[PDB]
Amino acid sequence: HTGVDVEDVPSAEWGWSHMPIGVMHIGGLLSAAFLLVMMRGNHVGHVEDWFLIGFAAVIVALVGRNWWLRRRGWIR
Amino acid sequence: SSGKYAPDLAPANEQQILTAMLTGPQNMPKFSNRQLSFEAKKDIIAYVKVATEARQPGGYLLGGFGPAPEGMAMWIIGMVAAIGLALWIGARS
Amino acid sequence: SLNRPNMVSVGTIVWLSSELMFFAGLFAMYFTARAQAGGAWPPEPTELNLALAVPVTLVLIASSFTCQMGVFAAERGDVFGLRRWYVITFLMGLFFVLGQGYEYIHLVEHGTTIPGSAYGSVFYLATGFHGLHVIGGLVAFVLLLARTKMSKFTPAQATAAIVVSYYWHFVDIVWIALFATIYFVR
Amino acid sequence: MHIEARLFEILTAFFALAAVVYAVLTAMFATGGVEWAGTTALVLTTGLTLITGTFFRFVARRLDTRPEDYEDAEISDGAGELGFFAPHSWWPILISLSFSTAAVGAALWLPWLIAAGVAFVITSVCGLVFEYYWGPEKH
Amino acid sequence: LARQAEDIDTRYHPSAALRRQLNKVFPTHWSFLLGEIALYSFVVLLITGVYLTLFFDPSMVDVTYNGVYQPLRGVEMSRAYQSALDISFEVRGGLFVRQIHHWAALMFAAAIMVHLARIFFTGAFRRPRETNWVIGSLLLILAMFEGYFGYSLPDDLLSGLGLRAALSSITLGMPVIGTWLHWALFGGDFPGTILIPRLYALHILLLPGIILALIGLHLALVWFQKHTQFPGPGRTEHNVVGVRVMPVFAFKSGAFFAAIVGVLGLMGGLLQINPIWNLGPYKPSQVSAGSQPDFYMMWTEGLARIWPPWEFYFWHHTIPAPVWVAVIMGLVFVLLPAYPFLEKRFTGDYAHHNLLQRPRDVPVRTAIGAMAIAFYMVLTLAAMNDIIALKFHISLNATTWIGRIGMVILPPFVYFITYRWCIGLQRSDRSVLEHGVETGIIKRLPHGAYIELHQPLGPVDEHGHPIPLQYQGAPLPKRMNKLGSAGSPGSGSFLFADSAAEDAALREAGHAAEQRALAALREH
Amino acid sequence: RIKPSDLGRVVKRKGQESFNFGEFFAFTKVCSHLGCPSSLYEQQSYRILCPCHQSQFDALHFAKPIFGPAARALAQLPITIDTDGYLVANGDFVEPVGPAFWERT
Ligand SMILES: CC(C)=CCC/C(C)=C/CC/C(C)=C\CC/C(C)=C/CC/C(C)=C/CC/C(C)=C/CC/C(C)=C/CC/C(C)=C/CC/C(C)=C/CC1=C(C)C(=O)c2ccccc2C1=O
Ligand SMILES: CC(C)=CCC/C(C)=C\CC/C(C)=C/CC/C(C)=C/CC/C(C)=C/CC/C(C)=C\CC/C(C)=C\CC/C(C)=C\CC/C(C)=C\CC1=C(C)C(=O)c2ccccc2C1=O
Ligand code: HEM
Ligand code: FES
Known part of the structure; x- marks a missing residue:
């Protein structure tokens, strides 16, 4: 495999156990973008826009925290 | 839409059905006696009283709706029994 | 170490006390609305x-003795007398349940319903929960018999038998109280 | 097991006295006579404490002192083998989910959902009870 | 008889291919019967459809009922709807047969999906069996469309609405071909006079023949490329451990077939499905709150319900919104058969495999599959918007938005949880390998320590602590009772005991037998 | 038929100001999303709902879509009365009816 540690995943030599982190980062960013676009052509009402922006901000905050901590050395 | 719903027609009697379609309660259109004659109304009343109280000739009515309860019953009864029979007949490890 | 007083026994006894409090709530419900109904308080229909x-009360009282015979057989570690006495107790409990249901059918046919009056409400709410407790006891009997079938007989199995035994005894005493209150005192 | 039974007996005495006093003082001096609700509640509270204290007395009068009942006892006295204590199990969460299904079906009046919840409850309780008694697969 | 067999030998002389097939070995794992479920459902479907074809008339010409079902007397219907009403109400057994048919169709679809789940999560699709994965995927698509065409033959209101909406109105909107395809398929505008006979031909001859041929090729590949197996004591990449065909495997297969036919008969007798008489004949002016095609087509309906209205208008042209639904459907249909090749390209693993994987040991693939199942379940729940909103007191707009947001936020959450859960199961296995099985018994150790009395699976050291073992891809025991620990009650029947001599003899015989079985499998 | 009390909350699409005969409006019944009958008329909300994929149209705002997967408004028919007092059509639809395609609405 491309590589993880058997101290992280015990059965790392028995199956696929690693997916790159850029995939998950850009996937979170794309999901946030989709949630934001999903209010184009707003039909009457705005209570759902608050849920949309809330979830988009939460996803962006999670991705940013993970990226920052991996960059400064507190992860890996 | 947005809250409101249309009720079940089982607990209504004939005079109640007649007055319902004569007066048109909230969000229900009012059916004038000139656009829907009294005889047509009586035929509709007979039809609903038959459709609400006739026994189903095919087994347990699964809620009166379409294939959503049927798929639920499939997954919960038939597939569960088949998988239990497979667990009994076969081995595991 | 061995702390001789049994643990499952204590747990079961204290839970039975809690269930007594539940039936206290039901009894208070029933006794209220009888002091309000004036004169002939059970209505005419x-x-x-x-x-x-x-008869069904006698059958339940006999169930108590058959279950005690079962636990006597349990304390001397043979499974087959236990199984016999507990199957007999299960059959008698099923007879009691069927008699109660038939009496319900006959009582609804020409009279009392839950939405009909206050007497029907208190009557059905007080006796149907006891019926549900009897059905729970029957399910417990079945589960215990299957567990005795599926492995070697041990003191843990004997303890399970004993605790099911006095759960059944609690149910019988509660029925005695309810019957004496509803049919004789009125 | 003397102190536990004594505790429950003290509670029983107080509850019985309060029950009888309230019953009499409402039979007289009250608007419509006996109150019929607090009276029943106090009577069966007395019954609760009575059942528990009686069981504790009857198991105590046929018992010899345990090391926890005994001062001047050493830790070497309790050496031995305690009972069986269940390690890991996943059946409680399934029992909870079954009961929640039945409860939602009772809140929203859906008899099919009530029936499904009761069946799930039976199945998960059987799973819990038979967990340490199933034997090996007989092939 | 001796003479008949002797003559069969002197005439055809198989006697070696026959032996070769009688000594074929099959593994015995409960999950290897999920394809048999689908096969038996298909056989029952064949029989009941052949029965049904003797009474059906697939015409769209109009008539008046004048039959036994009085609430429909005098109504203008088609000949197909009248044929279905006649099957239901005037043939002795026809309602029973068509209910068996519809229940068998639903069981067919469900069994195919559960079998696909097993194959995917165990990894049986790798190098030697990729073509069989592709064949199975084609079979799944064909079964979906065959059932869809099936429940549209009795031209009633609900099935006609589903036909109209999905088939007609999504085909009509496709970018360039569009109306040309719609008119080639319908002979003109939507309600014509050839649609029901054309679908009847397609449904009783073409798709059943193609499905039979593909099932034959599939089973032939499974028979000649031997079956996979799970890692275990005597199991190797080069052998097959199990039972031979002749005495045992055929017996078990036939018993399972009979049991499945029994279940289908019970539920085709006791549960009512598709009561077309409560509906009416299809008419373009009437509608009902009824919707929701059969459950295997519900994800397309839910996608059409929760997709947002994004359209494009440029020079004298139009691209409507259902084009998105069609595109996503085709994208799924393309990505399903390509997964083995995509995964081998990504992981760089081009080896041969005969041993299966446990789902906990492949966390990334298990999380991918869980994410896909979550997406499917969201789309399937979004199809019953109105029923959910009516029965569980929720707003219709609320259910729509809940589906729209869940479709994007739930699958990655399920992915994350599945990954961590598989790793936790692995760590549990590692703890059981390092120490012994936990027995549940506690001691007090006179100086006041509490210990747990583990039970080792191998050799111990001189200090008594077990020596740690290595993982080998096989499950590990977690309960003491699943090993023979406290078992074998009295040997009576249920109420009266046997004799002690018989009990002891049976106990000793069983113990010796199981010991020799485990020895014969572990030593060799 | 709209109550005479409102009759001032109508918005009257740009080219269809004279398409109504007083309080009668007569829109089409074929939904513009996938062709299902848009039958559910809520009279005190003045809303049109289709039971296929749950689109909603504002009967007081030229049947403009306000919720669901639909994107275009429902086509309106011109109506009038004849010399005998019967309601008749005052022409044809000014746009195609039903779902859209590559060529136009
Ligand atoms: C595992 C598999 C899906 C991985 C595929 C890999 C992937 C890369 C392929 C690409 C496909 C694309 C990208 C996404 C797929 C998502 C979707 C659009 C796929 C369309 C068709 C698809 C292939 C069907 C797969 C669905 C899945 C495999 C079914 C297996 C379900 C499980 C394992 C059955 C276990 C037994 C079961 C839980 C017993 C209890 C019953 C439960 C409640 C079943 C749940 C349930 C189900 C499943 C219903 O379908 C349903 C329908 C109507 C009403 C109710 C229900 C319902 O309650
Ligand atoms: C792909 C799909 C799933 C994606 C989605 C598509 C869509 C959404 C779903 C489907 C929807 C619809 C629109 C699909 C429509 C499909 C449509 C209905 C397809 C129907 C199939 C098709 C049109 C049928 C026509 C083709 C067919 C009839 C021709 C094949 C001919 C047949 C099968 C062969 C029969 C003869 C056979 C038994 C003998 C074989 C010959 C043998 C092997 C050699 C002959 C031979 C032998 C054997 C000797 O021993 C011998 C000895 C001595 C001398 C000479 C000979 C000798 O010549
Ligand atoms: C192989 C997969 C098949 C599937 C998934 C399937 C599915 C269905 C379904 C769901 C129906 C509607 C049943 C109802 O009326 O409620 C149906 C109808 C019908 N099927 Fe099938 N079927 C299959 C194979 C066959 C075969 C092989 C035949 C004939 C040889 C057949 C003949 C018929 C006929 C004639 C009808 C219409 C009769 C009626 O609706 O009552 N089917 N099919
Ligand atoms: S058809 Fe009316 S909303 Fe889709």
Whole structure:
């Protein structure tokens, strides 16, 4: 495999156990973008826009925290 | 839409059905006696009283709706029994 | 170490006390609305059939003795006498349940319903929960018999038998109280 | 097991006295006579404490002192083998989910959902009870 | 008889291919019967459809009922709807047969999906069996469309609405071909006079023949490329451990077939499905709150319900919104058969495999599959918007938005949880390998320590602590009772005991037998 | 038929100001999303709902879509009365009816 540690995943030599982190980062960013676009052509009402922006901000905050901590050395 | 719903027609009697379609309660259109004659109304009343109280000739009515309860019953009864029979007949490890 | 007083026994006894409090709530419900109904408080379309309520009560009282014979057999570690006495107790409990249901059918046919009056409400709410407790006891009997079938007989199995035994005894005493309150005192 | 039974007996005494006093003082001096609700509640509270204290007395009068009942006892006295204590199990969460299904079906009046919840409850309780008694697969 | 067999030998002389097939070995794992479920459902479907074809008339010409079902007397219907009403109400057994048919169709679809789940999560699709994965995927698509065409033959209101909406109105909107395809398929505008006979031909001859041929090729590949197996004591990449065909495997297969036919008969007798008489004949002016095609087509309906209205208008042209639904459907249909090749390209693993994987040991693939199942379940729940909103007191707009947001936020959450859960199961296995099985018994150790009395699976050291073992891809025991620990009650029947001599003899015989079985499998 | 009390909350699409005969409006019944009958008329909300994929149209705002997967408004028919007092059509639809395609609405 491309590589993880058997101290992280015990059965790392028995199956696929690693997916790159850029995939998950850009996937979170794309999901946030989709949630934001999903209010184009707003039909009457705005209570759902608050849920949309809330979830988009939460996803962006999670991705940013993970990226920052991996960059400064507190992860890996 | 947005809250409101249309009720079940089982607990209504004939005079109640007649007055319902004569007066048109909230969000229900009012059916004038000139656009829907009294005889047509009586035929509709007979039809609903038959459709609400006739026994189903095919087994347990699964809620009166379409294939959503049927798929639920499939997954919960038939597939569960088949998988239990497979667990009994076969081995595991 | 061995802390001789059994643990499952204590747990079961204290839970039975809690269930007594539940039936206290039900009894308070029933006793209220009887002090309000004036004169002939059980309404006229209500007539209690004493030709059906005494036999099933006797059958339940006999269930108690058969279950005690079962636990006696349990304490000397043979499974087969236990199984026999507990199957007999299960059959008698099923007979009691069927008698109660038939009496319900006959009582609804020409009279009392839950939405009909206050007497029907208190009557059905007080006796149907006891019926549900009897059905729970029957399910417990079945589960215990299957567990005795599926492995070697041990003191843990004997303890399970004993605790099911006095759960059944609690149910019988509660029925005695309810029957004496509803049919005789009135 | 003397102190536990004594505790429950003290509670029983107080509850019985309060029950009888309230019953009499409402039979007289009250608007419509006996109150019929607090009276029943106090009577069966007395019954609760009575059942528990009686069981504790009856198991105590046929018992010899345990090391926890005994001062001047050493830790070497309790050496031995305690009972069986269940390690990991996943059946409680399934029992909870079954009961929640039945409860939602009772809140929203859906008899099919009530029936499904009761069946799930039976199945998960059987799973819990038979967990340490199933034997090996007989092939 | 001796003479008949002797003559069969002197005439055809198989006697070696026959032996070769009688000594074929099959593994015995409960999950290897999920394809048999689908096969038996298909056989029952064949029989009941052949029965049904003797009474059906697939015409769209109009008539008046004048039959036994009085609430429909005098109504203008088609000949197909009248044929279905006649099957239901005037043939002795026809309602029973068509209910068996519809229940068998639903069981067919469900069994195919559960079998696909097993194959995917165990990894049986790798190098030697990729073509069989592709064949199975084609079979799944064909079964979906065959059932869809099936429940549209009795031209009633609900099935006609589903036909109209999905088939007609999504085909009509496709970018360039569009109306040309719609008119080639319908002979003109939507309600024509050839649609029901054309679908009847397609449904009783073409798709059943193609499905039979593909099932034959599939089973032939499974028979000649031997079956996979799970890692275990005597199991190797080069052998097959199990039972031979002749005495045992055929017996078990036939018993399972009979049991499945029994279940289908019970539920085709006791549960009512598709009561077309409560509906009416299809008419373009009437509608009902009824919707929701059969459950295997519900994800397309839910996608059409929760997709947002994004359209494009440029020079004298139009691209409507259902084009998105069609595109996503085709994208799924393309990505399903390509997964083995995509995964081998990504992981760089081009080896041969005969041993299966446990789902906990492949966390990334298990999380991918869980994410896909979550997406499917969201789309399937979004199809019953109105029923959910009516029965569980929720707003219709609320259910729509809940589906729209869940479709994007739930699958990655399920992915994360599945990954961590598989790793936790692995760590549990590692703890059981390092120490012994936990027995549940506690001691007090006179100086006041509490210990747990583990039970080792191998050799111990001189200090008594077990020596740690290595993982080998096989499950590990977690309960003491699943090993023979406290078992074998008295040997009576249920109420009266046998004799002690018989009990002891049976106990000793069983113990010796199981010991020799485990020895014969572990030593060799 | 709209109550005479409102009759001032109508918005009257740009080219269809004279398409109504007083309080009668007569829109089409074929939904513009996938062709299902848009039958559910809520009279005190003045809303049109289709039971296929749950689009909603504002009967007081030229049947403009306000919720669901639909994107275009429902086509309106011109109506009038004849010399005998019967309601008749005052022409044809000014746009195609039903779902859209590559060529136009
Ligand atoms: C595992 C598999 C899906 C991985 C595929 C890999 C992937 C890369 C392929 C690409 C496909 C694309 C990208 C996404 C797929 C998502 C979707 C659009 C796929 C369309 C068709 C698809 C292939 C069907 C797969 C669905 C899945 C495999 C079914 C297996 C379900 C499980 C394992 C059955 C276990 C037994 C079961 C839980 C017993 C209890 C019953 C439960 C409640 C079943 C749940 C349930 C189900 C499943 C219903 O379908 C349903 C329908 C109507 C009403 C109710 C229900 C319902 O309650
Ligand atoms: C792909 C799909 C799933 C994606 C989605 C598509 C869509 C959404 C779903 C489907 C929807 C619809 C629109 C699909 C429509 C499909 C449509 C209905 C397809 C129907 C199939 C098709 C049109 C049928 C026509 C083709 C067919 C009839 C021709 C094949 C001919 C047949 C099968 C062969 C029969 C003869 C056979 C038994 C003998 C074989 C010959 C043998 C092997 C050699 C002959 C031979 C032998 C054997 C000797 O021993 C011998 C000895 C001595 C001398 C000479 C000979 C000798 O010549
Ligand atoms: C192989 C997969 C098949 C599937 C998934 C399937 C599915 C269905 C379904 C769901 C129906 C509607 C049943 C109802 O009326 O409620 C149906 C109808 C019908 N099927 Fe099938 N079927 C299959 C194979 C066959 C075969 C092989 C035949 C004939 C040889 C057949 C003949 C018929 C006929 C004639 C009808 C219409 C009769 C009626 O609706 O009552 N089917 N099919
Ligand atoms: S058809 Fe009316 S909303 Fe889709």
